[PDB]
Design a protein around this ligand. Structure first.
Ligand SMILES: Cc1c(C(=O)C2=C(O)CCCC2=O)ccc2nc(C(F)(F)F)n(-c3ccccc3)c(=O)c12
Ligand SMILES: Cc1c(C(=O)C2=C(O)CCCC2=O)ccc2nc(C(F)(F)F)n(-c3ccccc3)c(=O)c12
Ligand SMILES: [Co+2]
Ligand SMILES: [Co+2]
Lengths: 377, 377
């Protein structure tokens, strides 16, 4: 049941922005670990005296890494005279975000038809404004409203190359890394109370509903913008990982980013080769029991050798009434046990592939738990 | 003329500590870019609720990367009950250092005979105390005094494995990277006024004197701890890079770390292969003129093929009355045009090799300048 109630025209996920202490080192680490190319920059070399911003791309996935310079470089500036390429940026906000949360996502950006009307309609419908619409070089419009915690939903609209003021990166500094990641599938928030979080976001977007936690998913009209939200379930045997998140993050924020791969086998081979030489680490692999039980539940989707390849790579598998999902989770991206990355690939729901095909893997909590018990046996 | 006037017994450089916003991402970037292994950790997994610290090693070179957790994790703690493994660490100091300077060296640590007496003698002789001697697990003593800006000189002494409370890293997360770097050769500060800086540091250590800047070098008794200091020369045609440093760094601080390689050819081959895939970038190479002129001034030290190999790798060469030095400079390590790394290898002065053999390359300012003019010709 999709009532298609978006209060404005939403296209696709556009980019994700990390607020960093040093954007150079985070961006270089992420580039090597995920196989993303350096594609654009805005920094001192492009005349930006306010912040350093570096853009990584893989397919349609766009990761932006931003950190503030010393405020003294831009002391004589005012907003009308700013050299910042992202005019919503504020030194004090960025330093306070990072001191409070550590490394994390500041902005979940979606491309819309008209960011100004998206901003107006959202605020008229209960959204808390964060940054008003601003038109950059008569070409791009950006605006921001609060999503949860200190994370903003950023609207971007183009009249007709990332953002004005960003320069394309010279091919020499731009090595064409690619491990097969192609787009952002979904972005997940952790909140203390799911109910009010859902009501707030669904209220101002018109997005419709699609051990440890309760969860629900908000989706755009074509269900290609997917925003799950989690809350903790207290008193449990094992402590809720959502609760641990809220403690170490100093409250609500983005929990994980799910990146669709065109070939999750190759992506995981390439990422695992680099885990211990600067890349990302992965969750411990499920026991062989789990892969033994895969034949019975997806043996009509995946061959034995594709199942054995899932086993070599530590991949999880879940299935809907409509599709099959292959997924794996990284360890936390930085110092705090907060944000992590999910790699996914979806099988089925051909029409193009409909969004969310196969679900989000919630069947794996019990399937992994069972298999852990069966391996102890 | 070495009067051997150290006011306490100094052994060798022990480690360099970076204060970071996210120690995980800086450490992983540095590990891949410099070929340093993860060798020790102190973080949540080892019971440290205060800071995340990760140690990289290559030969005797020790790089420590530290960042604070949320203060709320350790709210009930007091210094007598601290879970911090580095008891001089302070959340507010670390956040203020990083907000003010960005990514940079907080501590230059030297191993001494007795850090408590090193601390007492230093302060009795004009050093500004930063952190008093503290004995960790009856095994190691650490103390700190101000060096310049917000950089401390850290004394460490061992009764008889990095520091108590640090755990050795499991071999799986410890990939044995090695590009040939073996030890810290020297650590260089930038200050607004050289005279008072020298008088202060030489005053409390007893260390003796060994286009753009004025410079002098302080050295320990055996001249294996080398601490050059630079000041800007104003009014020049080209703007002093020392002055640019002080502007972007918000004042005095560590300018560069020189890392001795046992084979600077292999080190530079390995680092340059990784520059655009997460590693470090290097200064633009000198023109072929410069390598043409190398035959006349070091043609008795290096073969034509070793000179042509310097040319392939962009290496600089200078020579003393006693030795020959091969060196190269990275671009800045992070967002700000402040700290960078030098790779060096020294030829000559065999007795072991005496410290500082060949000097520090000051002859290259004019030699590079000349060669740039000759290449335009
Ligand atoms: C986050 C996530 C997801 C999933 O992506 C996420 C969706 O996007 C939105 C719905 C709720 C949420 O769950 C799905 C299955 C998962 N399954 C497990 C597992 F228990 F099966 F391994 N874990 C897990 C891994 C390590 C430690 C603790 C839990 C997950 O974190 C996990
Ligand atoms: C730092 C350094 C050193 C050297 O290590 C450093 C010593 O440890 C202590 C003495 C003073 C100081 O100078 C030596 C030669 C250098 N020579 C040049 C060069 F001009 F020849 F390339 N540059 C340079 C490179 C790029 C832009 C501007 C200057 C240097 O930064 C440079
Ligand atoms: Co997910
Ligand atoms: Co030097």
């Amino acid at each position: 049941k999709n009532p298609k109630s978006d209060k404005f025209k939403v296209k696709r996920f556009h980019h994700i922005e990390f607020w960093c202490g040093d954007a150079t080192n985070v961006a270089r680490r992420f580039s090597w670990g995920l196989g993303m190319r350096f594609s654009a920059k805005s920094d001192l070399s492009t005349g930006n005296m306010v912040h350093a911003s570096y853009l990584l791309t893989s397919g349609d996935l766009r990761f932006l890494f931003t950190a503030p310079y010393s405020p003294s470089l831009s002391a004589g500036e005012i907003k009308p005279t700013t050299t910042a390429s992202i005019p919503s940026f504020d030194h004090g906000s960025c330093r306070s975000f990072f001191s409070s949360h550590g490394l994390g996502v500041r902005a979940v950006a979606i491309e819309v038809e008209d960011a100004e009307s998206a901003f107006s309609i959202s605020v008229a419908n209960g959204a808390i404004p964060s940054s008003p619409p601003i038109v950059l070089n008569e070409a791009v419009t950006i605006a921001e409203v609060k999503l949860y915690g200190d994370v903003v939903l950023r609207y971007v609209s183009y009249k007709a190359e990332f953002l004005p003021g960003f320069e394309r990166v010279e091919d020499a500094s731009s090595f064409p890394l690619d491990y097969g990641i192609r787009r952002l599938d979904h972005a997940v928030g952790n909140v203390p109370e799911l109910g009010p979080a859902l009501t707030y976001v669904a209220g101002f977007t018109g997005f419709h509903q699609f051990s440890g936690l309760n969860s629900a998913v908000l989706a755009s009209n074509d269900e290609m913008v997917l925003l799950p939200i989690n809350e903790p379930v207290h008193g449990t045997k094992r402590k809720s990982q959502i609760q641990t998140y809220l403690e170490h993050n100093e409250g609500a924020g983005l929990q994980h980013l799910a990146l669709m791969s065109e070939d999750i086998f190759r992506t995981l081979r390439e990422m695992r080769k680099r885990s211990s030489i600067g890349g990302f680490d992965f969750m411990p692999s499920p026991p062989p029991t789990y892969y033994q039980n895969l034949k019975k539940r997806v043996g009509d989707v995946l061959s034995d050798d594709q199942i054995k390849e899932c086993e070599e790579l530590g991949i999880l598998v879940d299935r809907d009434d409509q599709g099959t999902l292959l997924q794996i989770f990284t360890k936390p991206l930085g110092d705090r046990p907060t944000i992590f990355i999910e790699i996914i690939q979806r099988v089925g729901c051909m029409m193009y592939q409909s969004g969310g095909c196969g679900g989000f893997g919630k069947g794996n909590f019990s399937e992994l738990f069972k298999s852990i018990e069966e391996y102890e046996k």
